[PDB]
Design an enzyme around this catalytic site. Structure first.
Site, PDB file in Angstrom:
ATOM      1  N   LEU A  53      13.474  20.483 -24.528  1.00 10.51           N
ATOM      2  CA  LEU A  53      14.697  21.068 -23.958  1.00 10.51           C
ATOM      3  C   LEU A  53      15.669  20.161 -23.666  1.00 10.51           C
ATOM      4  O   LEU A  53      15.477  18.940 -23.414  1.00 10.51           O
ATOM      5  CB  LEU A  53      14.007  21.699 -22.781  1.00 10.51           C
ATOM      6  CG  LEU A  53      12.599  22.554 -22.839  1.00 10.51           C
ATOM      7  CD1 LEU A  53      12.188  22.998 -21.544  1.00 10.51           C
ATOM      8  CD2 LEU A  53      13.176  23.700 -23.633  1.00 10.51           C
ATOM      9  N   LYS A  63       6.369  11.723 -17.516  1.00  7.71           N
ATOM     10  CA  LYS A  63       5.759  12.088 -16.083  1.00  7.71           C
ATOM     11  C   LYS A  63       5.158  13.542 -16.255  1.00  7.71           C
ATOM     12  O   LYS A  63       4.181  13.939 -15.598  1.00  7.71           O
ATOM     13  CB  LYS A  63       6.969  12.157 -14.999  1.00  7.71           C
ATOM     14  CG  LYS A  63       7.532  10.761 -14.654  1.00  7.71           C
ATOM     15  CD  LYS A  63       8.830  10.892 -14.003  1.00  7.71           C
ATOM     16  CE  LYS A  63       9.296   9.636 -13.278  1.00  7.71           C
ATOM     17  NZ  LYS A  63       9.310   8.660 -14.096  1.00  7.71           N
ATOM     18  N   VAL A  94      18.460  17.067   8.051  1.00  3.27           N
ATOM     19  CA  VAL A  94      19.692  17.450   9.082  1.00  3.27           C
ATOM     20  C   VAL A  94      20.905  17.550   8.330  1.00  3.27           C
ATOM     21  O   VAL A  94      21.394  16.758   7.678  1.00  3.27           O
ATOM     22  CB  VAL A  94      19.556  16.605  10.388  1.00  3.27           C
ATOM     23  CG1 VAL A  94      20.483  17.155  11.464  1.00  3.27           C
ATOM     24  CG2 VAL A  94      17.963  16.442  11.033  1.00  3.27           C
ATOM     25  N   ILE A  97      23.657  14.572   8.209  1.00  2.00           N
ATOM     26  CA  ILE A  97      22.945  13.522   7.720  1.00  2.00           C
ATOM     27  C   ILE A  97      22.653  13.391   6.460  1.00  2.00           C
ATOM     28  O   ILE A  97      22.123  14.010   6.020  1.00  2.00           O
ATOM     29  CB  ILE A  97      21.768  13.343   8.599  1.00  2.00           C
ATOM     30  CG1 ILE A  97      21.905  13.380  10.177  1.00  2.00           C
ATOM     31  CG2 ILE A  97      20.962  11.922   8.364  1.00  2.00           C
ATOM     32  CD1 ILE A  97      20.681  13.305  10.877  1.00  2.00           C
ATOM     33  N   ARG A 140      14.527  31.279   5.918  1.00  2.00           N
ATOM     34  CA  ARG A 140      15.599  32.076   4.607  1.00  2.00           C
ATOM     35  C   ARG A 140      15.965  33.249   5.356  1.00  2.00           C
ATOM     36  O   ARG A 140      15.510  33.811   6.335  1.00  2.00           O
ATOM     37  CB  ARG A 140      14.531  32.133   3.481  1.00  2.00           C
ATOM     38  CG  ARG A 140      14.368  30.621   2.742  1.00  2.00           C
ATOM     39  CD  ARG A 140      13.636  30.871   1.595  1.00  2.00           C
ATOM     40  NE  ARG A 140      14.661  31.716   0.620  1.00  2.00           N
ATOM     41  CZ  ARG A 140      15.769  31.124  -0.116  1.00  2.00           C
ATOM     42  NH1 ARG A 140      15.767  29.820   0.061  1.00  2.00           N
ATOM     43  NH2 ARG A 140      16.508  31.857  -0.706  1.00  2.00           N
ATOM     44  N   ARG A 174      24.544  36.913  -6.790  1.00  2.00           N
ATOM     45  CA  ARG A 174      23.598  36.632  -7.768  1.00  2.00           C
ATOM     46  C   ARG A 174      22.406  37.810  -7.626  1.00  2.00           C
ATOM     47  O   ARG A 174      21.317  37.637  -8.695  1.00  2.00           O
ATOM     48  CB  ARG A 174      22.964  35.186  -7.965  1.00  2.00           C
ATOM     49  CG  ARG A 174      24.258  34.464  -8.114  1.00  2.00           C
ATOM     50  CD  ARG A 174      23.918  33.275  -8.919  1.00  2.00           C
ATOM     51  NE  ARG A 174      22.580  32.538  -8.151  1.00  2.00           N
ATOM     52  CZ  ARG A 174      22.778  31.644  -7.210  1.00  2.00           C
ATOM     53  NH1 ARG A 174      23.855  31.357  -6.635  1.00  2.00           N
ATOM     54  NH2 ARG A 174      21.770  31.000  -6.591  1.00  2.00           N
ATOM     55  N   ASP A 181      21.889  31.042   3.078  1.00  4.96           N
ATOM     56  CA  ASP A 181      22.804  31.129   3.963  1.00  4.96           C
ATOM     57  C   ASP A 181      23.902  32.093   3.453  1.00  4.96           C
ATOM     58  O   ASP A 181      23.484  32.985   2.446  1.00  4.96           O
ATOM     59  CB  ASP A 181      23.548  29.574   3.995  1.00  4.96           C
ATOM     60  CG  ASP A 181      24.610  29.250   2.815  1.00  4.96           C
ATOM     61  OD1 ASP A 181      24.243  30.151   1.610  1.00  4.96           O
ATOM     62  OD2 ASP A 181      25.457  28.466   2.744  1.00  4.96           O
ATOM     63  N   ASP A 183      27.706  32.859   2.183  1.00  2.52           N
ATOM     64  CA  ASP A 183      28.856  32.395   1.659  1.00  2.52           C
ATOM     65  C   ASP A 183      29.868  33.723   1.318  1.00  2.52           C
ATOM     66  O   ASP A 183      29.534  34.632   0.804  1.00  2.52           O
ATOM     67  CB  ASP A 183      28.758  31.584   0.110  1.00  2.52           C
ATOM     68  CG  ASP A 183      27.776  30.590   0.120  1.00  2.52           C
ATOM     69  OD1 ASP A 183      27.579  29.775   1.136  1.00  2.52           O
ATOM     70  OD2 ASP A 183      26.770  31.033  -0.400  1.00  2.52           O
TER      71      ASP A 183
HETATM   72  N1  LIG Z   1      27.071  21.224  -5.440  1.00  2.00           N
HETATM   73  C1  LIG Z   1      27.452  22.403  -5.375  1.00  2.00           C
HETATM   74  C2  LIG Z   1      27.074  23.378  -4.215  1.00  2.00           C
HETATM   75  C3  LIG Z   1      27.541  24.537  -4.014  1.00  2.00           C
HETATM   76  N2  LIG Z   1      28.486  25.153  -5.352  1.00  2.00           N
HETATM   77  C4  LIG Z   1      29.015  26.385  -5.241  1.00  2.00           C
HETATM   78  C5  LIG Z   1      28.083  27.246  -5.952  1.00  2.00           C
HETATM   79  C6  LIG Z   1      26.983  27.696  -5.103  1.00  2.00           C
HETATM   80  O1  LIG Z   1      26.328  29.154  -5.652  1.00  2.00           O
HETATM   81  C7  LIG Z   1      27.995  28.079  -3.805  1.00  2.00           C
HETATM   82  C8  LIG Z   1      27.200  28.341  -2.542  1.00  2.00           C
HETATM   83  O2  LIG Z   1      26.618  26.975  -2.176  1.00  2.00           O
HETATM   84  P1  LIG Z   1      25.273  27.170  -1.577  1.00  2.00           P
HETATM   85  O3  LIG Z   1      25.266  25.631  -0.878  1.00  2.00           O
HETATM   86  O4  LIG Z   1      25.487  28.179  -0.241  1.00  2.00           O
HETATM   87  C9  LIG Z   1      24.076  27.524  -2.460  1.00  2.00           C
HETATM   88  P2  LIG Z   1      23.478  29.175  -3.055  1.00  2.00           P
HETATM   89  O5  LIG Z   1      23.975  29.098  -4.537  1.00  2.00           O
HETATM   90  O6  LIG Z   1      24.532  30.151  -2.299  1.00  2.00           O
HETATM   91  O7  LIG Z   1      22.141  29.506  -2.919  1.00  2.00           O
HETATM   92  P3  LIG Z   1      21.483  29.600  -1.320  1.00  2.00           P
HETATM   93  O8  LIG Z   1      20.541  28.290  -1.255  1.00  2.00           O
HETATM   94  O9  LIG Z   1      20.716  30.687  -1.333  1.00  2.00           O
HETATM   95  O10 LIG Z   1      22.662  29.619  -0.422  1.00  2.00           O
HETATM   96  O11 LIG Z   1      28.807  27.008  -3.848  1.00  2.00           O
HETATM   97  C10 LIG Z   1      29.046  24.410  -6.354  1.00  2.00           C
HETATM   98  O12 LIG Z   1      29.750  24.638  -7.146  1.00  2.00           O
HETATM   99  N3  LIG Z   1      28.455  22.936  -6.400  1.00  2.00           N
HETATM  100 MN   LIG Z   2      26.632  27.917   1.463  1.00  3.39          MN
HETATM  101 MN   LIG Z   3      24.615  30.119  -0.318  1.00  9.05          MN
HETATM  102 NA    NA Z   4      21.545  16.323   5.595  1.00 10.73          NA
HETATM  103 NA    NA Z   5      15.259  16.887 -24.653  1.00 12.33          NA
END
Ligand SMILES: Nc1ccn([C@H]2C[C@H](O)[C@@H](COP(=O)(O)CP(=O)(O)OP(=O)(O)O)O2)c(=O)n1
Ligand SMILES: [Mn+2]
Ligand SMILES: [Mn+2]
Ligand code: NA
Ligand code: NA
Ligand SMILES: [Cl-]
Ligand SMILES: [Cl-]
Ligand SMILES: [Mn+2]
Length: 326
Positions: A53, A63, A94, A97, A140, A174, A181, A183
DNA sequence: CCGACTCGCATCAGC
DNA sequence: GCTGATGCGA
DNA sequence: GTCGG
């Protein structure tokens, strides 16, 4: 769930590399491996099989062989036992942090939840709120509660200005049955790539949601991005709902489709798609897709009238939001 | 082997 | 104050 | 840690 043990191991290793080693490319490597294995529709029987993959290499393959043989990974067993690693890993749970602050706190002897409560004086505002709601932020959000929150946010925005459009994105869009959370992508015709004709467009919304006691705290706030805390109202004599994290992003109205693509994610999905865009000679952000010129400098924004238009440019078949949960 | 792997806000260093 | 880097986060 | 070239 076919390969939950493996993907859990890789995630824990990813978290170790981010939080403790401060090795973000290793974090991303483990994250990518875990994702590709998570959608693999066979129960993996060997590291060699996994190594086929993309993103699984020789070290992860080894691993996987250890884990398949023994149900464990020594490297993790010892990380789990090292005191500073475990303290650092805990404190980064947190909000506000990160690896830096977590190590500095552990350095000063602040290493437990009780330590943090005793030393609230030493946390910035974000971290103080993250501590306050640490327990609630572990829980959640059932999709059913996401639907009530959506109702509130959409109706409250409508009452500020009927020309606002608010869209719930992230895992909710999705189709997830539960989310970490909420968004919310926001647009208003007075804010385009060409001009901002009204000020305070995001503020007005935050204020309204605060006034009806939906938003309860603020972690960060600027002209286009809010990060805070919210809570559903509870009925008479009912226990209060947990406090929840909420992020709001005001996006230029003419750039909604790139914005909704970004905000829908997943994070890994975005990371892969942007990486593929680069392979294909484009760069994608939440605002535009631009071609890369002969020297790797972004050109002018290409026309986009649909999420699929973005997939088209980089020669990917369209993927519905529900199929973007990488 | 080896270089590569999008942006907003809070905070700090420097001026 | 502003500018740029860093930390942390979407 | 992985992998295209
Ligand atoms: N490093 C990152 C972090 C987030 N994003 C974008 C894509 C993600 O789906 C949206 C919400 O983030 P969130 O941190 O709210 C994660 P999410 O996909 O909404 O799933 P939940 O855990 O159920 O909230 O922000 C990105 O492009 N790059
Ligand atoms: Mn978010
Ligand atoms: Mn989210
Ligand atoms: Na943190
Ligand atoms: Na591979
Ligand atoms: Cl790294
Ligand atoms: Cl742009
Ligand atoms: Mn609470």
């Amino acid at each position: 769930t076919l390969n939950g043990g493996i993907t859990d191991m890789l995630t824990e290793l990813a978290n170790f590399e981010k939080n403790v080693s401060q090795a973000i490319h290793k974090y991303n490597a483990y994250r990518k491996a875990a994702s590709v294995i998570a959608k693999y529709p066979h129960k993996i029987k060997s590291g060699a099989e996994a190594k086929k993959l993309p993103g699984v290499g020789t070290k992860i393959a080894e691993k996987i062989d250890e884990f398949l043989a023994t149900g464990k990974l020594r490297k993790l067993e010892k990380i789990r036992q090292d005191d500073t690693s475990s303290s650092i890993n805990f404190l980064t749970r947190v909000s506000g942090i990160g690896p830096s602050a977590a190590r500095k706190f552990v350095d000063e002897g602040i290493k437990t939840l009780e330590d943090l409560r005793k030393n609230e004086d030493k946390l910035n505002h974000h971290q103080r709120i993250g501590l306050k709601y640490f327990g609630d932020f572990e829980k959640r959000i059932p999709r059913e509660e996401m639907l009530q929150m959506q109702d509130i946010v959409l109706n409250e925005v409508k009452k500020v200005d009927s020309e606002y459009i608010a869209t719930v994105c992230g895992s909710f869009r999705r189709g997830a049955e539960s989310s970490g959370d909420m968004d919310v992508l926001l647009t208003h015709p007075s804010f385009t790539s060409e001009s901002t004709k009204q000020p305070k467009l995001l503020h007005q919304v935050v204020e309204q949601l605060q006034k009806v006691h939906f938003i309860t705290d603020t972690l960060s706030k600027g002209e286009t991005k809010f990060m805070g805390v919210c809570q559903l109202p509870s009925k008479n004599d009912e226990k209060e709902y947990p406090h929840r994290r909420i992020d709001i992003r005001l996006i230029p109205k003419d750039q909604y489709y790139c914005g909704v693509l970004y905000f829908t994610g997943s994070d890994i999905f975005n990371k892969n798609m942007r990486a593929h865009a680069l392979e294909k000679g484009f760069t994608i952000n939440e605002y535009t897709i631009r071609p890369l010129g002969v020297t790797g400098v972004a050109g002018e924004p290409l026309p986009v009238d649909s999420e699929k238009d973005i997939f088209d440019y980089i020669q990917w078949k369209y993927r519905e939001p529900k199929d973007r949960s990488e």
